[PDB]
């Protein structure tokens, strides 16, 4: 994959990964992800329910405040409008009342959701090529505390003071 420097440690959590883990624990059979899998698109007439989380440009990160704000778009895809609305209601009930809630992701790291407000409300999108799937989409503003606000200015200074200076 990517060979990051040895002295570097992750500072931001992955909001999409955190919510994918959360809603795979909450809904085990129904698959949630950040993408449309090739095998999920194989069946359309009898489509399995799914939830998609997409990080979107929104909110201002506060490195000094140890806050990572982002806009999250949740797309609930089911075979019926009633099922899509029920699943979107479940997602909203899970996300909206969060305030300083902790959650241990699959990585073993316990994140902390500072707050989760709604930017754009749910709406049933018009069908596209996939005609038998009813999708309900909503955008949330999710603020999550960073893993660590530690800076690596020392390593950055060492780099150019050893190579150039």
């Amino acid at each position: 994959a990517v060979v990051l420097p040895d002295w570097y440690e992750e500072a931001f959590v992955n909001v999409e990964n955190l919510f994918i883990d959360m809603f795979t624990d909450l809904l085990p059979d129904y698959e949630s992800g950040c993408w449309a899998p090739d095998d999920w698109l194989a069946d359309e007439i009898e489509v399995k329910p799914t939830i998609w989380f997409f990080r979107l440009p929104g909110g201002r990160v506060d490195w000094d405040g140890r806050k990572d704000e982002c806009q999250l778009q949740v797309m609930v895809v089911t075979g019926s409008r009633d099922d899509s609305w029920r699943l979107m209601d479940f997602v909203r009930a899970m996300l909206l009342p969060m305030q300083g809630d902790k959650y241990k992701m699959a990585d073993g790291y316990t994140a902390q959701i500072r707050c989760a407000g709604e930017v754009a409300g749910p709406q049933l999108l018009t069908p596209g090529q996939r005609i038998d799937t009813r999708v309900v989409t909503a955008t949330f503003k999710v603020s999550v505390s960073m893993k660590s606000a530690k800076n690596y200015k020392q390593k950055l200074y060492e780099l150019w003071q050893a190579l150039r200076g």
């Binding site: 506060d62 405040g65 140890r66 806050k67 704000e69 305030q99 300083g100 500072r114 603020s143 200076g165």
Partner: protein, 199 residues
């Protein structure tokens, strides 16, 4: 500890954490009159030569403190308004200052001291030994008529490095017994000197 001590106007030196690393910081019965010596250091860098602009307030004290909003999206922020008093020892309440190689460049233009017009190197004709004796090495200190030691700023070039070799630091270690002319290379100004070598 120092931040909370300033906020609460108390000395938390004796506050010993519990066996589980827990501390409680009681506010004083009457707000104490605790004085501090504060410095406000700032650095502006020109190329690689920094300018250290700072204030020296030696008898500051907390005056007021803004209200703190405790939300989930912002950390706790302490905003004291320190007031600078006049210390009777140093005689001043605040003193702006400048330092650094950038200020060595900008001091003549700023109007402090005489203008940079001439440059001289203090040893008129130094002599160094070829052998590794006491006088093997020497130091060149180019200093303008402004009174400022421009040695780190000025790079010196030797016409005859075989006799005497002088680097940008004014090293007079030397190579062979002889006399070499050292020219202090600067920009609009230039300085000249002669260095002799004798074992």
């Amino acid at each position: 500890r120092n931040v909370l001590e300033l906020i609460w106007t108390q000395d938390f030196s004796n506050i010993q954490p519990s066996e589980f690393g827990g501390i409680v910081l009681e506010a004083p019965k009457v707000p104490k009159n605790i004085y501090y010596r504060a410095i406000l250091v700032g650095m502006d860098d020109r190329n690689d030569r920094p300018i250290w602009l700072y204030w020296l307030m030696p008898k500051v004290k907390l005056d007021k403190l803004d209200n703190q909003t405790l939300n989930d999206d912002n950390v706790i922020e302490y905003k004291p308004t320190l007031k600078a008093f006049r210390d009777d020892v140093v005689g001043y309440s605040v003193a702006q200052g400048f330092a650094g190689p950038g200020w060595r460049d900008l001091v003549a233009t700023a109007g402090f001291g005489e203008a940079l017009t001439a440059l001289t190197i203090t040893p008129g004709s130094p002599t160094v030994t070829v052998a590794t004796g006491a006088s093997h090495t020497a130091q060149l200190l180019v200093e303008g008529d402004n009174g400022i030691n421009y040695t780190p700023d000025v790079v010196f070039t030797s016409s005859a490095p075989d006799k005497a070799s002088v680097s940008a630091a004014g090293l007079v270690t030397g190579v062979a017994a002889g006399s070499a002319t050292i020219t202090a290379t600067k920009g609009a100004l230039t300085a000249t000197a002669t260095v002799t070598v004798t074992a």
